[PDB]
Amino acid sequence: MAAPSRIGLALKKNEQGIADIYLDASGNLSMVQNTEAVGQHARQRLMTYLGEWFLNKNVGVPWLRDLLGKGYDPVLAEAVIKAEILSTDGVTEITSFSIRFDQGRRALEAFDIEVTTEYD
Amino acid sequence: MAAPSRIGLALKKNEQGIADIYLDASGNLSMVQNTEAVGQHARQRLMTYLGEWFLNKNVGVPWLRDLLGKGYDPVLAEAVIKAEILSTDGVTEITSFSIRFDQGRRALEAFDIEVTTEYD
Amino acid sequence: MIIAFSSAIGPVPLTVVISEKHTSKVELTTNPIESGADVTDHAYVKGKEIELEVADRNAAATWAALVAFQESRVPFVLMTGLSMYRNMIITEIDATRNAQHSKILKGTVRLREVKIVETGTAEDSSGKDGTDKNKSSNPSKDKAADAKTADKANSGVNAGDKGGTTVAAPRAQSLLKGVFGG
Amino acid sequence: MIIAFSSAIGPVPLTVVISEKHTSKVELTTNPIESGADVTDHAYVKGKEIELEVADRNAAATWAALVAFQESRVPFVLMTGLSMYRNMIITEIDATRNAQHSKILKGTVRLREVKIVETGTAEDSSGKDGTDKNKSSNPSKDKAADAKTADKANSGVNAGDKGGTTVAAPRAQSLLKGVFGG
Amino acid sequence: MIELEVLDESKQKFSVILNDRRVTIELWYNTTNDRWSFSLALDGDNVVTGRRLVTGVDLLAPFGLGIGALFLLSENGEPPTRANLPLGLVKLYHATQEEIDAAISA
Amino acid sequence: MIELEVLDESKQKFSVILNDRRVTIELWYNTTNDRWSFSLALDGDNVVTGRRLVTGVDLLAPFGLGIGALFLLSENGEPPTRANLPLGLVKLYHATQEEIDAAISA
Amino acid sequence: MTYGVQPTGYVKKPLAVHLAEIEASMVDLFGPGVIQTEQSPLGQLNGLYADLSYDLDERGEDLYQSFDPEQAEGSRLDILARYRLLSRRAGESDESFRRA
Amino acid sequence: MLEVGYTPPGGGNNIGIIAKGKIRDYQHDREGGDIISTVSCGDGDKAYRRATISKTIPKGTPLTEVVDEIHKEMKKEGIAKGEWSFPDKVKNTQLKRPYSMCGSCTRELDTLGRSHGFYWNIQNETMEIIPGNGHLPGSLLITPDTGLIGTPTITDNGIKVKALINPEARPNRMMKVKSQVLKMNRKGEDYRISEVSFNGDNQEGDWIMTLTGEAIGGDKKVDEGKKAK
Amino acid sequence: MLEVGYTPPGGGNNIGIIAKGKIRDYQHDREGGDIISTVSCGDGDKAYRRATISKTIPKGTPLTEVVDEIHKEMKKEGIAKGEWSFPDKVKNTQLKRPYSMCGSCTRELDTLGRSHGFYWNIQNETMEIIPGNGHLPGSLLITPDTGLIGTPTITDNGIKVKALINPEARPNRMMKVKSQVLKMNRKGEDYRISEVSFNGDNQEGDWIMTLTGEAIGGDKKVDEGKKAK
Amino acid sequence: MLEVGYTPPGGGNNIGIIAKGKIRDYQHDREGGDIISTVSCGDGDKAYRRATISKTIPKGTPLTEVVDEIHKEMKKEGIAKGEWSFPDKVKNTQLKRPYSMCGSCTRELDTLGRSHGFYWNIQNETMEIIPGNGHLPGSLLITPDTGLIGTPTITDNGIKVKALINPEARPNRMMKVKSQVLKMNRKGEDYRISEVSFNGDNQEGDWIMTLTGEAIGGDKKVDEGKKAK
């Protein structure tokens, strides 16, 4: 029972670092495929705030409710980010995950995240 | 209820040590009988790798999952070998079993294994 | 490694959480012999259970707040030190005053996860199903984000036969003349 | 003499296994007078049960992983110090976070062996029986070792009586033009 | 007309009420030619066995079974494949005779 | 025609439906000659008792019971012994007079 | 017969049946005591034969279907269309040609 | 429509219709505060009530054309045609006088059954007819390796077998039942299907179906059981 | 007479007759050593057995004088007259042809009902008559503030409401039912009373009654339900 | 044949026939893995289904010779003759007109009983006849010193007594029942036997029988109970 093929609109970051739809060298609207599609979908899932969508207030991450605030907490942030990534369709496992906090920038940094999809 | 008689194609090791079909002195195909047949069937069962047979991936011995690796363990080796030998039809008991490991060769050696069949 | 939470059930705050108990049940079902062969649809995941042991400085005020919150019967997100839990309802609150602890609140709170997303006899079916994971879920009043959007998205509520309320005779005559007399 | 296993339930590893508890039941059945004379068909081997008492350094992460793997409901091989066990299901997980152990996962896992090879209706009666110990087992989609051999050996899945989804009037009329007018 | 769902199984069978007859259909994939095939039994009697599923033609026309037309469709006329038929890129349809007459007259 | 199972017991007794009649057949092994005999009852009355089971002939021809033919067969004419009859090296078959007639006509 | 070419069409034989028939035939020759399990050499021979014969059974079905215009596909469909004077137009798909 | 079946994490769908329902009666219920809606439905239940025929019949008419004529009126009420396998005595019989038809279709349907002992029934808005000693084509395997619960329970004529609900099982078909018990019980493998029972739950009470079958004899006929005048 | 009710320490008496009994059958019972006397009584049970009438009745006679006539014989057996509310079609009908009466009163009482679709019944030695789609005057409130237990359970036509036995609840009356659930069930408030059930105990099993009502429409008529010929 | 009784270490045998059985239907059953064989048997089951008589009978014939005649036909079906005790009104009656017999023997046996009220029954392949108000010779003592469990339960007419199955108890005989309850309950000692119930187990449930008797009056007659026309 192989993994079904997936497809979605490609998003590339522009000169300001904001993700926007793109035209490849051919000039036709670029579409992402099986595994890069799931990766970009996981990004759009991570970037959405809970209760933001007017048709469904249950999608999004509770960035503002849980993490963004006065409470640096690695276990909670790790749990929330893993939940969001693992709930993405096509993702099977997260093999690695590292997290740290720069007090000067007040920057919470999650890196070394390796995601394995059903396409292996 | 006497033990039913069994028969199968006989395998004999050629000059390369590989077990092959054999034709006896008269030239007709050699078949093994009640107890030698069970012993050779037990050998053929021991020599199979789990998941190798495409029509039935549940047959075979889990050599590559359990013993072959960085884990020399006499207890699990004895368990795997005894279970596969005993599950052979026509085998009643194993009366003796020895196991040892040659670190120089990395050879797992099970020897002095006595099997009693239903033909006594 | 624990979540490092704020130590409260729902809104009402507590001074101390003395102990957590977490339970997750999966019910298997078996007939007299082993019936299988491409069937594992027979296993059910039960709603999770939590048993906190808590204490508070303001005994009477905290007890009243806990009882009122319990009686509202409103599901809530319970923050524990081992996991986050959505849709929890308090099923039991127990409190003991004795010689050892007489002037504080000390007791047990039991919580259970709530099951849901099925009423039907007042809901209908017109289009999509909702089980497709590459599509958005069906818009409904429950999951709309605004009052206007909920008005737009309401699937509509449909309960059975109504009985209208009869009107007093003179009021009825006045109203019927008011409309149907000119 | 132990197997010297690795201390992991399914895919989720554990830091400590505190105690293993094994049980193997046979259920006998008896009527009023001793009824025998070459009848021993009445004794049933039950599914084996395992009770592990485990602990882990990463409390919240391990609790989440165990809960997710439990809710998956996928039978799996369990390695214990006393035996292997095929097709186990975690029927229960429990954890306690108290003063003695507050920053670790410290709890218990209950596992029951599954029992199967019986669904039936989609499976037909065309050839062999499979009970004969001198013959190969019947080729079936489930035990085939490849997708192609699974397709070849699929005995057939027979859905019950079906209702077809109707086609909207204009779409249907256009399609009929396309087929039966061309 | 109606659409007949197809499962993702190399061999499947279902039953439907077509013109108020019990029609049992058995679809099976032939890997050697990579094509789908159907047998049709009317009320327990096997009337059609081993026909090829082909797009763009009535599959029951030769037999005069009196159970309407049974036909496949795809957007660009692809042929039905192991992957393409269950995914709904090729759809199986049953059209009643009156519906066919009405469309032909329209 | 139908094959009849034989259990691996010296004495056994089963019932079958032949030409719309319930027939009770008992099989009993005689050790002195290493042979089998069968008794046959129609509707509760034993009408045949103590008949040796022999190969290649209709065992009921003398009796005109109207339940067709009951006979034995093997690969190369091996006689039905204690172990050969349960193992299926020798097999017990029943056929009707209709099938026998149609096969002879062939 | 129950399989093969029949009045209703080609009754294709399942792989399980292909294997069961050969196992029963081997029992007819070597007695019910013969060992045919997956691991033994006879089981090796039986499995391979069952699969080759299922493949041949499927090719028989394909050849049977390729005599009908509504079931042929391509050059065979052209051969059968030349009984009615249709020549595949250049680039005409098999759907459009079978329609024609 | 009541669809039941199995939807395993791998595999696929086994779900089929085990009852197509014309609502009989419904009623809500608390247990604590719950609300359980107890539905009862209808099987050919529009035909059991509103189907009434209109019929003169002349002499000489064969013995099936007016099963068709009665199915005309049943089809007015939304019934489908199943397999009709008449007795041989029926297929060849002709007539001498005229055949009153005025009143209740089901009434004189039952008198049909009693008039030569054939079964007729409605199976999810589909009408089937079989002989008393006959059955319809279609077979189902029931084994400890194919969905068997317990022993195959032995009865005078045939068996009563429990299994997992899995949707092929329809009345007037054949079940081939295998076990380690029936062999020493010398009971055959092929049985007709006469009774079907479905009981099950989504959470706890698994899918169970029970099938009662009256055994097929060597002659390919069912052990009718002694019908009593 | 079986008088039931509530006798609170303050308040007063709520006790009334819920069933007036002509003994049907009694039987003692030991459980341990006890003696429980299980009584069964009779409802109009002298009229269900010993009431037989004698009637020549001529043409032209209206369609109610002879309900009085039949009640004469049913009154010889100690039955009282309740409220009679006939259908309007009934109140105005007259006669072409004469009206046999020989045999059993209750038997052809039943044919009465089946023949003009009306209800008649005996309620504690008092006989009432209503139309099929109608009811009798008299209303009774059931709310969580007035003795409501659980749901005003919803049904196809009306409701089935449990409450504390409190004596007025008679068949052929009206009950106004209120709760916090019926509003979202959109179900009305006024229902006829068709079935009455009394189950209770003195120590543990509280006084419980259950009333089945078929809803009144906006037309002041009962939702009869489809009568099947 | 079903033999029940007591076989103490001393004493002797108390085992007698409590039901002689013509098999009705059998069926095996798992409970875990068990196999319980559930038998139902037949009592006069040959005569309830295959007894049909052939009779012209003339005027002037007495009123019992043809009970012998009908027992001839039920004797063709293996029924023994029990004790026959007709009413005195029956014994002396003669005839004016002839007596159709064509069809079901048990059917018009019942119409006998309703024609003028006598009981007839079959008790283990034996046919007994008694009057409605009479009984047959034979008495059995039932006391706390002779097999009494609990109270002798009192009823409208007679009693219902439990005891240890102990085989004399037949329908249409007499029980003399004594206890410490009946005395203050002012109930006689002699009762007819009308209902018999045997429930028992070999391992757990004691042998238990329950007998219902309608009391015999001072005039040596049974308290029939009001037969309702």
Mark yes or no for CB contact I28/J154 under 8 Å: yes
Asked if residue I167 lies in contact with residue I16, where contact means CB atoms within 8 angstroms, the answer is yes
Helix residue spans in H25-118 (DSSP H): 47-50, 65-76, 88-91, 105-116
Q: Which residue has the tokens 């059968």?
A: G80
∠ Cα J101 J103 J106 (to 5°): 95
Q: Estimate to the nearest angstrom the gap between the alpha carbon of B96 and the chain centroid.
A: 15
Q: How far is C1 from chain A (nearest CA, A)?
A: 7
Answer whether D166 sits within 8 Å of E100, measured CB to CB. no
Percentages helix, strand, coil for chain D, rounded to the nearest 5?
20, 35, 50
Quote helix, strand, coil % in chain J, to nearest 5. Answer: 15, 30, 55
Q: Which helix (H) or strand (E) holds E36?
A: strand E35-42
CB-CB contact of F38 with F30 (8 Å): no
* Sequence letter at residue J81: K
Best CA proximity match to H103, nearest among H54, H58, H57, H65? H54
Q: Kindly give, in sequence order, each residue whose CB lies less than 8 Å from that of residue B14, ignoring residues fewer than 6 positions away.
A: B20
Q: Identify the residue whose tokens are 């269900």.
A: I48
Q: Beta strands H126-131 and H80-84: pairing type?
A: parallel
Half-sphere exposure at residue C61, Cβ-oriented, CA atoms within 13 angstroms: 7
The answer to whether H191 touches H172, Cβ cutoff 8 Å, is: no
**Cα(first)–Cα(last) distance of chain C, in Å?**
80
Residues 6+ positions from D118 with CB-CB distance below 8 Å: C33, C34, C35, C36, C37, C39, H143, H144, H145, H146, H147, H148, H149, H163, H164
Through-space distance between the first and last CA atoms of chain H, rounded to whole angstroms: 39
Residue J66 to residues C52, J45, J78, J126, J135, Cα–Cα distance (Å) = 88, 22, 18, 17, 22
Q: How many CB atoms lie within 10 A of CB C1?
A: 19
Backbone angles phi, psi at J22, to 5 degrees: -100, 115
Q: Is the dihedral of CA A22, A26, A28, A32 positive or negative?
A: negative
Question: Can you tell me the distance from the alpha carbon of A13 to that of A43, in angstroms, rounded to the nearest whole number?
Answer: 12
Which helix H or strand E contains J108, and what residues bound it? helix J105-116
The SS3 assignment for E87 reads coil
Cβ atoms < 10 Å from Cβ of H211:
26
Rounded CA Rg of chain I: 21
> Nearest to residue D2, comparing CAs of D23, D12, D17, D24?
D17
The length of chain C, given as a count of residues: 182
Distance from CA of H14 to the nearest CA of D (A): 5
How far is residue G44's CA from residue G35's CA, in Å, rounded to a whole number? 11
Interface probe with D: pick from G3, G21, G37, most Cβ of D within 10 Å: G37
Residue D117 CB burial class (10 angstroms; 0-12, 13-18, ≥19):
buried
CB interface of E with G, residues 11-70, below 8 Å? 28, 30-33, 35, 37, 39, 46-52, 54-57, 59, 61-62
Distance CA F69, CA F40 (A): 13
Question: Could you say which DSSP state residue G69 is in?
Answer: T
Distance CA D139, CA D149 (A): 9
Inter-chain residue contact C41 with H147, CB threshold 8 Å = no
Chain centre distance of CA H167: 13
The answer for residues whose C-beta is within 8 angstroms of residue J171's C-beta and 6 or more apart is J121, J123, J128, J193, J194, J195, J196
- Alpha-carbon distance values, J171 to B77, J120, J220 (Å): 75, 11, 17
Please compute Rg for chain D using Cα positions.
Answer: 26
Catalogue the E-assigned strands of A2-90.
Answer: 8-9, 11-13, 19-21, 31-32
Surface-to-core class of residue D99, CB atoms within 10 Å of its CB (0-12 exposed, 13-18 middle, 19+ buried): exposed
| Lookup: tokens for E77 | 């006329």
Residue in D60, D68, D147 closest to A75 by CB: D60
Q: Which of C62, C149, C69 is nearest to C105 (CA)?
A: C62
Q: Which of C97, C98, C92, C10 is nearest to C60 (CA)?
A: C97
3-state secondary structure of G2: coil
Which among H25, H28, H49 has CB closest to I228?
H49
Nearest alpha carbon to residue J193 among J144, J156, J158, J219: J158
Which residues in chain J are closer than 8 Å to H155, comparing Cβ atoms? 25-28
Sheet holding I118-122, edge to edge: I80-84, I126-131, I118-122
Residue F25 to residue F16: CA distance in whole angstroms: 8
| Residue B114 to residue C8: CA distance in whole angstroms | 67
Give residue for tokens 């429509």.
H1
The two tokens of residue I100 are 């046999």
CB count, 10 Å around CB of C37?
Answer: 22
Q: Look at residues H176, H217, H169 and name the one whose alpha carbon lies nearest to residue H194.
A: H169
- Among residues B38, B36, B37, B63, the alpha carbon closest in space to that of B49 is found at B63
Locate the chain C residue with the closest alpha carbon to D116: C36
Question: How were these coordinates obtained?
Answer: cryo-EM
J202: its two tokens: 């070999």
Q: What is the DSSP letter of E61?
A: G
The beta-carbon contacts of D88-91 under 8 Å, at least 24 apart in sequence, are: D88/D50, D88/D112, D88/D113, D88/D114, D89/C26, D89/C28, D89/C43, D89/D113, D89/D114, D90/C26, D90/D9, D90/D10, D90/D66, D91/C25, D91/C26, D91/C27, D91/C28
Q: Which amino acid is at H147?
A: G
Q: Identify all chain H residues contacting D123, using CB atoms and an 8 Å cutoff.
A: 141, 146-147
Beta-bridge mates of residue E3 = D165, E93
Residue reference for tokens 């001072």: J218
Which two tokens mark H228?
A: 């009593």
Which of C31, C38, C121 comes nearest H206 by C-beta?
A: C31
What radius of gyration, in Å, describes the C-alpha atoms of chain E?
Answer: 13
Instruction: Give the one of C134, C139, C153 whose C-beta lies nearest to A89's C-beta.
Output: C134
C81: left (phi over 0), alpha (psi -120 to 50) or beta: alpha
CA distances from J146 to H115, J6, J179 (A): 57, 14, 10
Q: Judging by beta carbons within 10 Å of its beta carbon (0-12, 13-18, 19+), is residue I8 exposed, middle or buried?
A: exposed
Contact status, residue C128 vs residue C155, Cβ threshold 8 Å: no
Q: CA D159, CA E7: separation in Å to the nearest integer?
A: 9
- Give the largest Cα separation in chain B, rounded: 50
Which two tokens mark H116?
């030569």
**Three-state secondary-structure class, residue H95:** coil
Amino acid at C165: T
Instruction: Say yes or no: D180 contacts chain E, CB-CB below 8 A.
Output: yes
Nearest in space to I226 (alpha carbons), one of I161, I174, I156, I172: I156
Distance CA I124, CA I21 (A): 8
| Orientation of helix E97-105 relative to helix D169-176, angle to 10° | 80
| Cα dist from I23 to C116, F100, I45, J156, whole Å | 52, 76, 9, 10
Searching chain G, which residue's CA lies closest to the CA of residue B3? G33
Burial label, A38 (beta-carbon count in 10 A; 0-12, 13-18, 19+): buried
The 3-class secondary structure across I91-143, one letter per residue, is HCCCCCCCCCECCCHHHHHHHHHHHHCEEEEECCCEEEEEECCCCCCCEEEEC
Helices (H), chain E: 97-105
- Residue I121 tokens read as 């019944």
The secondary structure of I177-191 as a DSSP string is E--SSTTTTT--SEE
Whether B76 and D4 have beta carbons less than 8 Å apart is answered as yes
What radius of gyration, in Å, describes the C-alpha atoms of chain C? 26
In this complex, the chains that touch H, judged by 3 or more CB pairs closer than 8 A, are C, D, E, F, I, J
Rg over alpha carbons for chain H, rounded to the nearest Å, is 21
C-alpha triplet B15, B20, B26: angle, nearest 5°: 90
Evaluate whether E69 touches E62 at the Cβ level (below 8 Å). Answer: no
CA gap I133, I87 in Å, rounded: 9
Contact with chain D for residue B55, Cβ under 8 A: yes
Closest C-alpha to J207, from J12, J6, J2: J6
Q: For residue I41, count CB atoms less than 10 angstroms from its CB and return exposed for 0-12, middle for 13-18, buried for 19 or more.
A: middle
Q: Give the containing element (helix H, strand E) for F71.
A: strand F69-74
Q: Would you call G31 and F75 a contact, using CB atoms and an 8 Å cutoff?
A: no
DSSP H166: -
Count H helices and E strands in chain H, helices first. Answer: 4, 12
B26: DSSP letter = T
Residue matched to tokens 């005689």: F30
- Asked whether the beta carbons of D56 and D14 are under 8 A apart, the reply is yes
Distances (CA, A) of I64 to I86, J22, J117: 9, 59, 40
Tokens found for residue J121: 């029954």
Query: CB atoms < 10 A from the CB of H69, how many?
Result: 15
Tokens in use for J44?
A: 């006069």
Q: Enumerate helices (H) and strands (E) in chain J, giving the number of each.
A: 4, 14
CB contact set of J218 (below 8 Å; sequence gap of 6+): none
Length of chain B: 120
User: Which tokens sit at D137?
Assistant: 């087992």
Chain H contact present for D37, CB below 8 A: no
Under 8 Å between Cβ of G98 and E57 = yes
- For chain D, list the contacting chains (3+ Cβ pairs, <8 Å): A, B, C, E, G, H, J
Task: Give me the residue label for tokens 């149907």.
Answer: C180
Resolution stated for this PDB structure, in Å: 3.2
The DSSP code sequence of D82-147 is S-EEEEEEEEEEEEEE-SSSSSSEEEEEEEEE---S---TT---SS--S--TTSPPPP-TTT-SSH
Return the SS3 of F8: coil
Question: Do E37 and G58 form a contact (C-beta atoms < 8 A)?
Answer: no
HSE-up of residue F57 (Cα within 13 Å, Cβ side): 9
- Do residues H120 and H86 touch, judged by C-beta distance below 8 A? no
CB B76 within 8 A of CB B112: no
- Whole-number Å distance between alpha carbons of F4 and B101: 56
* Nearest partner of I18 among I45, I49, I52, I41, judged by Cα: I41
Q: Are H182 and J59 in contact (CB under 8 A)?
A: no
Q: Give the separation between CA J4 and CA J1, rounded to whole angstroms.
A: 10
Would the CA dihedral through B60, B66, B72, B77 be positive or negative?
Answer: negative
Q: What is the DSSP string of J14-81?
A: --EEEE-----EEE---STT----EEE--SSTTHHHH----B---TT--SSHHHHHHHHHHHHTT-EE
Dihedral pair phi/psi, residue J31, rounded to 5°: -145, 90
Task: List, in order, residues 6 or more apart from C154 with CB less than 8 Å away.
Answer: C140, C141
- C-alpha C180: how far from chain center: 50
Hey, CA dihedral for D131, D135, D139, D145, is it positive or negative? positive
Instruction: Assess B39–D contact: CB distance below 8 Å, yes or no.
Output: no
Backbone angles phi, psi at D12, to 5 degrees: -90, 120
Helix axes I65-76, I105-116, angle to 10 degrees: 150
Task: Judge whether D155 and D124 are in contact, CB under 8 Å.
Answer: yes
